[PDB]
Amino acid sequence: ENPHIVILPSPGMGHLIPLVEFSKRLISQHQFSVTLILPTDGPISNSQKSFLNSLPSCMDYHLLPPVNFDDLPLDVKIETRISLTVTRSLSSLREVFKTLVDSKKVVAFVVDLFGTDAFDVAIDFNVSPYIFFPSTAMALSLFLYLPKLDATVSCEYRDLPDPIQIPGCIPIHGKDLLDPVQDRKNEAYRWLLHHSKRYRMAEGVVSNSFKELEGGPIKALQEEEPGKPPVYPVGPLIQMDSDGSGCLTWLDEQPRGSVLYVSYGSGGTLSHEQLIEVASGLEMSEQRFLWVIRCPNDTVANATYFNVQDSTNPLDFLPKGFLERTKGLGLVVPNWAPQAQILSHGSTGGFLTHCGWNSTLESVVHGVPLIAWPLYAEQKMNAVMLTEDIKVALRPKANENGLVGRLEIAKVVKGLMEGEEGKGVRTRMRDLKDAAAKVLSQDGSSTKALAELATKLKNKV
Numbered sequence: 496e497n498p499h500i501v502i503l504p505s506p507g508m509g510h511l512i513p514l515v516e517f518s519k520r521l522i523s524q525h526q527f528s529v530t531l532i533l534p535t536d537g538p539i540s541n542s543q544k545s546f547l548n549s550l551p552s553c554m555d556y557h558l559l560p561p562v563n564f565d566d567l568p569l570d571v572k573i574e575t576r577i578s579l580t581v582t583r584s585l586s587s588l589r590e591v592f593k594t595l596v597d598s599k600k601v602v603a604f605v606v607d608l609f610g611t612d613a614f615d616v617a618i619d620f621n622v623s624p625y626i627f628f629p630s631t632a633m634a635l636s637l638f639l640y641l642p643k644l645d646a647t648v649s650c651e652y653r654d655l656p657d658p659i660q661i662p663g664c665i666p667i668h669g670k671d672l673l674d675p676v677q678d679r680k681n682e683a684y685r686w687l688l689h690h691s692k693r694y695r696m697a698e699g700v701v702s703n704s705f706k707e708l709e710g711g712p713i714k715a716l717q718e719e720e721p722g723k724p725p726v727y728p729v730g731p732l733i734q735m736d737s738d739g740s741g742c743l744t745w746l747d748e749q750p751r752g753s754v755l756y757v758s759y760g761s762g763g764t765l766s767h768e769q770l771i772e773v774a775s776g777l778e779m780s781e782q783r784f785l786w787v788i789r790c791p792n793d794t795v796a797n798a799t800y801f802n803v804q805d806s807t808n809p810l811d812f813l814p815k816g817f818l819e820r821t822k823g824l825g826l827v828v829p830n831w832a833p834q835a836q837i838l839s840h841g842s843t844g845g846f847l848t849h850c851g852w853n854s855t856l857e858s859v860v861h862g863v864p865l866i867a868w869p870l871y872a873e874q875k876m877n878a879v880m881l882t883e884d885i886k887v888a889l890r891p892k893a894n895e896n897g898l899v900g901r902l903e904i905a906k907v908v909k910g911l912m913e914g915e916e917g918k919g920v921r922t923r924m925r926d927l928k929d930a931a932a933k934v935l936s937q938d939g940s941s942t943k944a945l946a947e948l949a950t951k952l953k954n955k956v
């Protein structure tokens with residue numbers, strides 16, 4: 496029977512997308528079969544049910560019974576929620592894992608960055624545990640480095656005067672480290688230390704990056720050390736392609752490389768004030784834009800938005816007349832857009848992104864230069880390497896209070912689409928687009944790393 500792999504994503508579609516591509520390439524290139532075990536905290540949406548019921552043939556899934564979070568404070572950090580989703584699911588995971596081991600030749604149990612507590616079931620059934628790291632190699636280096644870092648400094652990382660030196664990475668200031676390490680007293684940092692200390696138990700770590708993108712970190716990560724698992728960089732793992740919003744029909748009416756795509760992520764929120772400056776900044780830029788807009792996290796006190804203070808329609812928070820005035824140049828789509836297809840469209844010449852790694856990789860595979868606007872999670876770390884190391888992103892400056900003025904926005908937008916500053920990022924992003932195609936080619940470095948992993952796992956049966 497085929498060598499079988501069991502995969503446990505952490506809650507969140509952002510983690511699921513890259514894991515499904517990893518499975519698809521293991522199935523197509525090395526004749527694996529895959530089971531996706533999904534913890535839940537409630538009912539799944541209809542869109543999720545469709546995505547799951549349209550998975551490839553040799554890939555099935557099993558949904559665990561929902562965990563209850565009524566005890567968690569409303570201020571609970573997501574990393575705490577994710578971690579607790581695994582521990583509170585271990586009983587039902589154990590039952591499901593039993594049946595798989597009885598019926599299939601299970602050669603590996605792949606968890607993601609916050610699933611180390613599922614190692615105990617893997618060990619109990621004599622299945623090699625693996626970690627899929629859905630983010631950057633720099634972030635992966637930081638995880639492996641964190642037990643040492645945590646012991647070298649006890650103050651909050653923001654208060655460190657000098658930049659933190661992660662092995663093999665560009666120096667980065669503590670204030671730019673990922674969110675769950677910004678408050679060392681929060682359960683989120685404790686959970687992160689818990690998992691990172693347990694990365695040594697993994698037989699391997701799959702990294703969603705490639706060498707042309709992060710040669711420094713990957714080189715440091717692959718240097719052997721006792722207690723350090725081997726690292727397989729197999730990226731870019733993105734849903735690579737070959738419309739109820741009418742986005743793509745609109746893009747068909749625009750010239751080539753002329754539209755700035757704007758998305759602040761699925762969870763990214765701006766202050767209403769900041770949202771106003773973004774809308775106004777896009778108008779002052781005089782460029783074409785496609786903006787997937789979501790509601791702001793608060794409302795400005797101006798009377799113009801007194802009747803929509805409680806509105807859930809994102810379009811109600813725009814400056815009055817903004818849509819009328821920009822109808823020819825800009826398309827504003829509310830809440831969700833066909834991103835992958837938008838970044839593949841030839842009329843897209845730029846992407847103002849929150850620097851989520853899946854969005855970043857999709858933009859890299861399609862060669863779309865970036866304006867980096869990090870918001871949460873590890874996005875500030877990603878912005879730094881994108882702006883200062885890889886140099887494929889422009890970054891607007893904010894005032895003392897973190898407000899990016901309409902003028903700075905208009906400047907960076909024009910800078911990316913027309914200005915001298917955007918010439919180099921566009922060029923370097925095209926070189927990375929070609930690099931992404933090389934590493935995923937027949938003899939590419941990421942295709943070979945996946946084959947190295949596939950060989951090790953098949954040699955267990």
Ligand SMILES: O=c1ccn([C@@H]2O[C@H](COP(=O)(O)OP(=O)(O)O)[C@@H](O)[C@H]2O)c(=O)[nH]1
Pocket residue numbers: 508509510512758760761762787830831832833834835850851852853854855857872
């Ligand atoms: O309007 C949107 C926003 C996001 N995405 C998809 O959601 C993922 C973005 O996740 P990322 O890792 O960039 O950061 P996150 O939003 O998960 O924090 C990518 O697959 C995008 O294509 C999308 O299709 N439409």
